[PDB]
Amino acid sequence: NSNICEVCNKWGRLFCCDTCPRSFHEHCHIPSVEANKNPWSCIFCRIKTIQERCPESQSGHQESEVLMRQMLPEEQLKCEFLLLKVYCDSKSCFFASEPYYNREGSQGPQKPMWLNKVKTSLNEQMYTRVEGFVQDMRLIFHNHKEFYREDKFTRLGIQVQDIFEKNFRNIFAIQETS
Ligand SMILES: [Zn+2]
Ligand SMILES: [Zn+2]
Ligand SMILES: [Zn+2]
Numbered sequence: 001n002s003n004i005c006e007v008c009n010k011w012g013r014l015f016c017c018d019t020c021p022r023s024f025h026e027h028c029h030i031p032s033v034e035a036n037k038n039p040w041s042c043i044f045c046r047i048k049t050i051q052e053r054c055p056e057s058q059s060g061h062q063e064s065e066v067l068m069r070q071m072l073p074e075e076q077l078k079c080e081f082l083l084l085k086v087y088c089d090s091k092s093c094f095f096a097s098e099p100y101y102n103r104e105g106s107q108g109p110q111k112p113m114w115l116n117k118v119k120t121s122l123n124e125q126m127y128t129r130v131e132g133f134v135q136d137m138r139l140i141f142h143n144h145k146e147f148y149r150e151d152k153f154t155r156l157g158i159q160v161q162d163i164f165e166k167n168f169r170n171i172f173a174i175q176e177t178s
Pocket of ligand 1: 005025
């Protein structure tokens with residue numbers, strides 16, 4: 001197994017996947033690494049299994065249909081994995097914890113949002129449809145773009161949104177388009 005966490009790329013107290021060489025800090029893995037379970041399979045492995053059990057699940061889909069899906073166990077897992085893929089980028093640090101807004105010439109957003117809040121919301125089963133999770137994730141980057149205006153720091157929201165959107169299209173097998 002790897003000797004660094006797959007998500008934050010640091011050593012420490014790591015839990016090893018039994019079906020692949022990845023390793024994780026307890027709270028870097030989403031959901032948090034489960035207490036017992038021998039063997040244990042990580043979220044990358046659990047997602048691969050869904051795909052292998054239903055190869056047709058990788059045929060193209062319309063985003064509008066994906067968003068209306070109820071958060072049954074497989075869609076819950078897919079959103080957890082998508083959230084994890086955002087945290088895997090080091091630029092997620094900017095969006096992880098609760099932001100505050102005091103900049104000359106800007107007003108803070110009406111509805112602040114951040115990754116750890118989405119994480120808690122998923123853990124607490126607060127989303128009933130995929131749309132709920134996706135809306136809150138897109139809101140993180142939209143709020144950032146609006147607040148930072150013409151400051152070059154706006155680019156960080158574009159960059160992490162692009163990681164989100166690429167992984168969304170991959171995980172939910174969104175029909176490829178030009
Ligand atoms: Zn970690
Ligand atoms: Zn694994
Ligand atoms: Zn099938």
